[PDB]
Amino acid sequence: AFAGVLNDADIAAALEACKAADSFNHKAFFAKVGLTSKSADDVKKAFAIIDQDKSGFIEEDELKLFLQNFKADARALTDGETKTFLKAGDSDGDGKIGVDEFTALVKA
């Protein structure tokens, strides 16, 4: 769903880097795919894509499918990767990621 608002080469490269089980690193991914330099406006747009049910949060089920937003046939994250990613972003410990928590994950 971004393929068009991040460049295709960056996406490709970001996915190939984490093809192996447990090789995902969200900072590595965000840097390679090019989100880290994006405006807060574009980051909010990205958030909304990942929030598949538009609940206002990325719940754990959605985070597991994180890569599939970028390329539909991408692998699911392992449970291990998902928890690590949730724990880095979930600042208030409610077990989900809201928009400002996502912006911080991307940016800092």
91 near its own copies, rule: CB under 8 A: no
Q: Which is nearer to its own copies, 24 or 70 (CB)?
A: 24
Query: For residue 13, what is the enclosing H or E element?
Result: helix 8-17
The answer for 20, left when phi > 0, alpha when psi is -120 to 50, beta otherwise, is beta
Contact region with Ca ion (CB under 5 A), list: 5-13, 15-23, 24-32, 85-93: 85-93
87 near its own copies, rule: CB under 8 A: no
2 near its own copies, rule: CB under 8 A: no
Specify the residue for token string 């990942």.
50
